[PDB]
Amino acid sequence: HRYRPGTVALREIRRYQKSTELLIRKLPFQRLVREIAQDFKTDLRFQSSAVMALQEASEAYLVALFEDTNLCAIHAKRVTIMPKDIQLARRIRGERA
DNA sequence: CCCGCGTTTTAACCGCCAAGGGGATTACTCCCTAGTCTCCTGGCACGAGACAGAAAAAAACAA
């Protein structure tokens, strides 16, 4: 049959909140880090541990930001997060101007 | 707008194979060092110095 929209989303929320493994596949993230670093200094080498630490910090920060975004969206009587939500959360945080 | 399902490809992995490059050993080559071989014109005349030196053992013959 068909699951009504919004139920499988709750199932994934339950699934991913019980687990800790990283949600971004490694190699694209590593290539993105390498590209970003290249603009600061050339012919650079990275320890896999450094790259893993970068991924852990980035994913945790993104999860916290998504939590704040969901809270902001709920405050607007809304269920869907939209860019203004991220913007407001970042603004109140003080990272974005 | 966004969710849930149907279809495609490669990208992430592994295994084996084949181009292309790096290190220890090997092919030469160049320079240096080390060690030899041979020669120093055609000759001619005359002279003078080297006639080995010690020591052990068997035999002849005087006594």
Coordinates of C-alpha atoms (C1' of nucleotides) in Angstrom, one line a residue:
Chain A
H1 CA 0.0 0.0 0.0
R2 CA 1.0 3.6 0.7
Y3 CA 2.2 5.3 3.8
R4 CA 0.6 8.7 4.4
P5 CA 3.1 11.6 3.8
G6 CA 4.9 12.6 7.0
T7 CA 5.0 9.1 8.7
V8 CA 8.2 7.7 7.1
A9 CA 9.8 11.1 8.0
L10 CA 9.1 10.5 11.6
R11 CA 10.4 6.9 11.2
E12 CA 13.7 8.3 9.9
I13 CA 13.8 10.8 12.7
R14 CA 13.5 8.0 15.2
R15 CA 16.1 5.9 13.2
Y16 CA 18.8 8.6 12.9
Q17 CA 18.5 10.0 16.4
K18 CA 19.2 6.5 17.9
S19 CA 22.4 6.2 15.7
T20 CA 25.7 8.2 15.7
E21 CA 27.3 7.3 12.4
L22 CA 28.1 10.1 10.0
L23 CA 25.5 11.0 7.5
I24 CA 27.7 12.5 4.8
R25 CA 29.5 10.0 2.7
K26 CA 33.2 10.5 3.3
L27 CA 34.8 11.1 -0.1
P28 CA 32.7 14.0 -1.4
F29 CA 33.2 15.7 2.0
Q30 CA 37.0 15.1 1.8
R31 CA 37.1 16.5 -1.7
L32 CA 35.2 19.6 -0.6
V33 CA 37.6 20.1 2.3
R34 CA 40.5 19.7 0.0
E35 CA 39.1 22.3 -2.4
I36 CA 38.4 24.8 0.3
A37 CA 41.9 24.4 1.8
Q38 CA 43.5 24.8 -1.6
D39 CA 42.3 28.4 -1.8
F40 CA 44.3 29.2 1.4
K41 CA 47.6 27.4 0.7
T42 CA 48.8 25.2 -2.1
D43 CA 50.1 21.6 -2.2
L44 CA 48.6 20.8 1.2
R45 CA 48.3 17.3 2.8
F46 CA 45.7 16.3 5.3
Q47 CA 45.8 13.6 8.0
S48 CA 42.7 11.4 7.9
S49 CA 42.2 12.1 11.6
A50 CA 42.1 15.8 10.9
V51 CA 39.5 15.3 8.1
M52 CA 37.4 13.1 10.4
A53 CA 37.5 15.7 13.1
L54 CA 36.4 18.3 10.6
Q55 CA 33.5 16.1 9.5
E56 CA 32.4 15.4 13.1
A57 CA 32.4 19.1 14.0
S58 CA 30.6 20.1 10.8
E59 CA 27.9 17.5 11.1
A60 CA 27.3 18.3 14.8
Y61 CA 27.1 22.0 14.0
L62 CA 24.7 21.3 11.2
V63 CA 22.5 19.1 13.4
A64 CA 22.4 21.8 16.1
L65 CA 21.6 24.5 13.5
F66 CA 18.8 22.3 12.1
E67 CA 17.4 21.9 15.6
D68 CA 17.3 25.7 16.0
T69 CA 15.8 26.0 12.5
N70 CA 13.0 23.6 13.4
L71 CA 12.3 25.4 16.6
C72 CA 12.1 28.7 14.7
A73 CA 9.8 27.2 12.1
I74 CA 7.5 25.8 14.8
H75 CA 7.4 29.3 16.4
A76 CA 6.0 30.5 13.1
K77 CA 3.2 27.9 13.4
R78 CA 5.0 26.1 10.6
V79 CA 6.2 22.5 10.1
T80 CA 8.5 23.0 7.1
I81 CA 11.9 24.7 7.6
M82 CA 12.5 27.5 5.1
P83 CA 15.6 29.6 4.5
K84 CA 14.3 32.6 6.6
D85 CA 14.3 30.2 9.5
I86 CA 18.0 29.4 9.1
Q87 CA 18.7 33.1 8.6
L88 CA 16.8 34.1 11.8
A89 CA 18.5 31.3 13.9
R90 CA 22.0 32.3 12.6
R91 CA 21.2 36.0 13.2
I92 CA 20.1 35.4 16.8
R93 CA 23.1 33.1 17.3
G94 CA 25.3 36.0 16.1
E95 CA 27.3 34.2 13.4
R96 CA 25.5 35.9 10.5
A97 CA 25.4 39.7 10.8
Chain B
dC1 C1' 5.0 22.2 -1.8
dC2 C1' 6.4 18.2 -0.3
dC3 C1' 6.2 13.1 0.4
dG4 C1' 6.5 8.0 -1.3
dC5 C1' 7.4 5.0 -4.8
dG6 C1' 9.5 3.1 -10.0
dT7 C1' 14.2 3.5 -13.2
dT8 C1' 19.6 4.7 -14.3
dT9 C1' 24.3 5.2 -13.4
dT10 C1' 28.3 5.7 -11.1
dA11 C1' 30.8 6.1 -7.6
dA12 C1' 33.0 3.5 -3.5
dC13 C1' 35.2 -1.1 -3.0
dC14 C1' 37.9 -5.2 -4.3
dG15 C1' 40.7 -8.3 -7.2
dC16 C1' 43.9 -8.9 -10.9
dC17 C1' 46.5 -7.1 -14.6
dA18 C1' 49.6 -3.7 -17.2
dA19 C1' 52.4 1.4 -18.0
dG20 C1' 55.5 4.3 -15.7
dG21 C1' 58.9 5.7 -12.0
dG22 C1' 62.5 4.9 -7.8
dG23 C1' 66.4 2.3 -5.2
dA24 C1' 70.5 -1.4 -5.0
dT25 C1' 73.4 -3.5 -8.0
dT26 C1' 75.6 -3.6 -12.4
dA27 C1' 77.3 -2.2 -17.6
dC28 C1' 80.8 1.1 -19.0
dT29 C1' 84.1 5.5 -19.0
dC30 C1' 87.4 9.1 -17.2
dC31 C1' 90.8 10.4 -14.1
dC32 C1' 94.2 9.2 -11.0
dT33 C1' 97.6 6.2 -8.9
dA34 C1' 100.7 2.4 -8.9
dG35 C1' 104.0 -0.6 -11.0
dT36 C1' 107.4 -2.1 -15.1
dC37 C1' 110.8 -2.5 -19.9
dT38 C1' 113.8 -0.8 -23.0
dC39 C1' 117.2 2.3 -24.8
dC40 C1' 120.9 5.8 -24.6
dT41 C1' 125.9 5.8 -32.3
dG42 C1' 129.6 2.9 -35.6
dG43 C1' 133.3 2.0 -33.3
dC44 C1' 139.1 1.1 -32.7
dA45 C1' 143.6 0.7 -29.6
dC46 C1' 146.0 0.0 -25.1
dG47 C1' 146.4 -1.0 -20.0
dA48 C1' 145.6 -3.1 -14.9
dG49 C1' 142.9 -6.3 -11.0
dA50 C1' 140.3 -10.6 -9.4
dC51 C1' 144.8 -17.0 -8.6
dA52 C1' 137.8 -17.6 -2.9
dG53 C1' 138.0 -18.7 2.6
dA54 C1' 136.9 -22.0 6.9
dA55 C1' 136.3 -26.2 9.0
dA56 C1' 135.5 -31.5 9.7
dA57 C1' 137.1 -36.2 8.6
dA58 C1' 139.8 -40.2 6.4
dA59 C1' 144.5 -41.8 5.1
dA60 C1' 150.3 -42.1 5.2
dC61 C1' 153.7 -42.7 7.6
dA62 C1' 157.2 -41.4 11.6
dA63 C1' 157.7 -43.1 16.1

